[model samples]
Target: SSLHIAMFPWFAMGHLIPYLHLSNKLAKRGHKISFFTPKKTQTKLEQFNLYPNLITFYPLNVPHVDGLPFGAETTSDVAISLGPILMTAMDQTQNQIELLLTQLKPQIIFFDFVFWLPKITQRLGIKSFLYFIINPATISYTTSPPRMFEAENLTEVDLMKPPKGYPTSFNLQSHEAKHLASTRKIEFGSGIPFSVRSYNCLSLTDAIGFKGCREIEGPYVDYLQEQFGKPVLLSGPVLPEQSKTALDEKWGSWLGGFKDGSLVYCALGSELKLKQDQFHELLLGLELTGFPFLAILKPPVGFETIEDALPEGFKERVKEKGIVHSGWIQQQLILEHPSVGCFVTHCGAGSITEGLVNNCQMVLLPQLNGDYIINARIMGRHLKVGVEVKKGEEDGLFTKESVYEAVKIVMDDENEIGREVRSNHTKVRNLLLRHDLESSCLDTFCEKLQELVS
Candidate 1:
């Protein structure tokens, strides 16, 4: 008997990558997997030749709801605001899943933080699991939002202050605070409220899965389980095979030219929209550091003033020392490059794990969105895996000086902390390999599914 599993990924690279990896893993175990998303994604997946026959793709045409943009590929493109986006995604996804369930009757449904899907899963008598593709420390912070809310209650203030023990404390500047507060106001809308939204979402899961191994996560795993009272599975990082084409080989040769522990790979995840000023600041910071670097400069969505953001003479100054690709690169391959010593990243879980798997140090430059702030803190303070940049008045916005210092610290040859972090990286890699040898999570998941179906 084939165990059928249905997966619906939020339409974004960060969400899609891990879900695709998991879907492929399940298919390898002989489970029939159905992947549901927009038609564009199906085309892309087909191009990659991933899960070619074992997994099926289903297209969903989301009808335009009030306050939502028509024909949006993702919630990020929706203009109804974050809270409304969450609510609308929840409602629309439920309808879409109902349609899929009627056709496939999957034994289990795997979701990627789509909060409303669990309710539908319950109603349909399907077992549901949430794959939290963030660090365990992040899960710890989000699962305990009431503690944060209670701290806020004590102060009786609605301010974005740094949580206790964070690497860098922060208070949102007046203008930024006002913008975020207004956004939160619309999202929560006199309901459960934004402060408690993180915690509320965690409570909806049957079991939570993380895209980290116990080695990389350290104590954060125990903390998350205690907080959520659910079985948190520290699945090993899900990495696709590195591309082996001639183009990849040519880039591989270029990467081999740099000295070991010298290059920094910097990328803000594909979705983050940087203002022209912030983008230029990043360019300036990289030039000032004088380090060998590779950057992926994704143009901001719906933002047209980006050309004005470049610092005067910025491109001419560092064009020789660094490679700035306006489009995408093979990120996992770049991270694993021998000469790649450090990462300047948005702290997305996929990138974070890629860095860890490659034993590369990190300088975290998180975006204000999603669960990145919490991931940054956990990686910096508890895991000893990376350093978080100090933010300015804006949440998750760091000064150029902070970026410089973070890069220096991670790249410093004589720095004891940097050396220790590298050693820790080796320790994590070894443990993940050991788990793969004796207790592979992919095999574990397949075994459990077999029993469940039987």
Candidate 2:
């Protein structure tokens, strides 16, 4: 039973890329995919549309809100502070979404953040899955029934605890929990609090889906199913198939200069613009490691260029051994390089997956975002595959010393913690690389979807 599916994700590249990868997987299985994205974003996504014939991009007319910069169609186009405005822009697309869904008439539509989508999909007789680009563990931790619906005067301690009967193994620290509490009250879009908006999607959607497999997140997936009383679908970490293309020549040449397993390559994924103090500490931390390193990041807030934001004497100190670049770098190819021995990342799911499949050891430096916090815990605590930078309990801030320590622990062969993380990472990497694992996962996922529409 072939299916016609529609894919609509939040406008962040973090969100869009995973959705497109899932679309590619479904397309390969003879399913037809109608992918909705903003007009300009489609141009960037063109290369990843592996099966153009089976999958199609339908342009969305993003209605601009008052505060947004002109032509801001995605999170990449604006700072994280303006994300709510972008969400408002996405919310304003309801009319267009309805019209497109009516015309496409797909059997199933996978979406996140567009809380109104289920109502429209229901009216059109389409099954709407509230699909998450975040893994099940993060979603279950953040938006479980008690956390979302039952709490009126939730405290910081409440935020720290996992909802009753949640899978045990990892717990939020004082700082991460505080970050979660504050974010809960944020008006995500159209005047809805972040938690409330998430609840609406979970309550209204016909089913729930995640870009993860039960292999790593089985208990959390089960917990969500019981709480929501909906079929929780696992898409099996639908990462893009490994690319055939070579690394860009300049990056290849520069990275090749370092000795094997001697470089630490760091990136805080797009949209995480740090304050200048924190950014300076991060760069100095990389320098302190004494390993050749490459740091790709946006300029700190209020600074137009990364060079301008550099701490005094930083460039001269690390000039020979390090490079701090601001523009986009090919992350996947960089990870694949033999010299990149450690990956210091913000623990976004896509970035984690890319790092996990490569030979690099992990150093987790999660930002304030709930998703990042939870992902870091899963890697650092539960999986023991990475070392997370230590942060102040109340302030949730890491200094250069913490960053240096985290990288050093993972890169240092003589350290006990480093050896344990390295051994665990290798085992997980081998498991992920097994032949037919992803294919088998896709077969099962597609089978379930076919059953749903039967």
Candidate 3:
């Protein structure tokens, strides 16, 4: 039986794009998808929607909240500090959402962050799924509390301890624990703490959804299932489909200048901003590699542009070999390039997935907190598919030498460590791209949804 589903993801491109990928899959199977996006953000999603006929875009007029500038719809439009204000605006869309759901009459609605959605869906006799773009490992570790206790009172020491019966391999470091403790108490939206929203979201939703398969995250998924006593759904790997449009000519030609499998491509995720000293060390580290490189990054804190942030004589020295452009670039397409051999990244879920599927070898540099730390360990330690840069335990800082060493390990095929990860990466890549993997998974996913509403 075909299903009519509603998609209401958090107002971030990272969250929105994955929802669209799932929408495209459901639409291909003759299911109808009504995807709700910010009015302006809908235009940005136009090209990603492959099945425009089966999938419809419903623009949400984001209600303005105090302190947010006019037309600040998504995280990209404002300073990171203003994210709470954006959430407040998203919460204000309840009236519009209720009317839309009432008129559309979809059987299931998928959402995140807006904890009140399940309440409205229950009243309207529609099932709700708290779909998560973040990996299950991070969710299971941070938010899935065992006892019924408030999160507001938890100190860093308390936050460091895991819930009873949790997995052992995914332990949090001291710095990571402290970061989590601070963020948990943040007023996320409408005077609600961040952890409260997450805890309530797990309690209220009819089911939970993850953008991963049982193969990679089976244990974490199982833990969450028993913890919440809810049916957890998996959407397979959800790899982005290959682009029909050609890579931009400028990038294509520049990369083509290098020998096949000779250059390195590096980008920390969009949200990260390193201090000036750290940024200088990172760039100088690349120079030490003596390999042609391209880095896409924001200016370091207290700087204006990539040029001004450069170390002395750094540009002239690496003039022909490196390009540090402080702006956005097509990461997926760049990873796929034949000339690019090593990928240095901050281990975001999207970047990890993209880098894994490509031919490039991975060098991980995890962010200070959140899912990135867990993801880096899983790839670098658990799966042994990448090498992680060594960092100072308390300060969470990596030097130029450590950065160079990590890259050198991955780039050298003759090195035992390098050969080990290369072998593992190939096996995982082959398994991910195996014939009928995604199709079989999606077929079962659809069957499970049918069972839920039967």
TM-scores vs. true structure, each candidate: 0.80, 0.97, 0.96
Candidate 2 lDDT (Cα, whole model)?
0.86
**Compared with the true structure, what per-residue lDDT tens digits does model 3 show for residues 1-454?**
8999999998887788778888988998999999999999887788788988989999999888999879878887766678889999999999999999999999999998988999899999999999888888888877886523744667777767766777657556677778888887889889988878888899999999888877887788899999999999888888876544568999999999999998989998666678999999999999999999999888888898989999999999998889998776777789999999999989988888888888889999988757898889889888889999988766788899999999999899799999999999998888788888788889888998998777
* Candidate 1: count of backbone clashes, pairs at least 3 residues apart or interchain: 1
Candidate 3 TM-score to native: 0.96
Worst 10 residues of 2 by lDDT: 238-247
- Residue 112's lDDT in candidate 2: 79
* Candidate 2 residue 400 C-alpha distance from true site, Å: 1.5
Tens digits of per-residue lDDT for model 1, 341-373: 889988877777677677678888877643565
Error of 1 at 277 (Å): 3.5
Model 2: per-residue Cα lDDT over 1-454, one tens digit each: 6799998999999989888888887888889999999998898888788899999999998897899899989888898888998999999999999999889899999887988888888788899888887878777877888787655577678877788878866777887777777878889888998888888899988888887766787788899999998888788877556544557899999888889999999998987788898998899999899999999899998999988999999988887799999887789889988999999999988899999989899999989888888899889888899999988888887899999998988888899999999999998887776787777778877887877777
Ranking by lDDT: 2, 3, 1
- Model 2 spans with C-alpha error above 4 angstroms: 243-246
Instruction: Name the weakest run of 10 consecutive residues (lDDT summed) in model 1.
Output: 162-171
lDDT of each: 0.65, 0.86, 0.86
Q: Of the candidates numbered 1 and 3, which has the greater lDDT value? A: 3
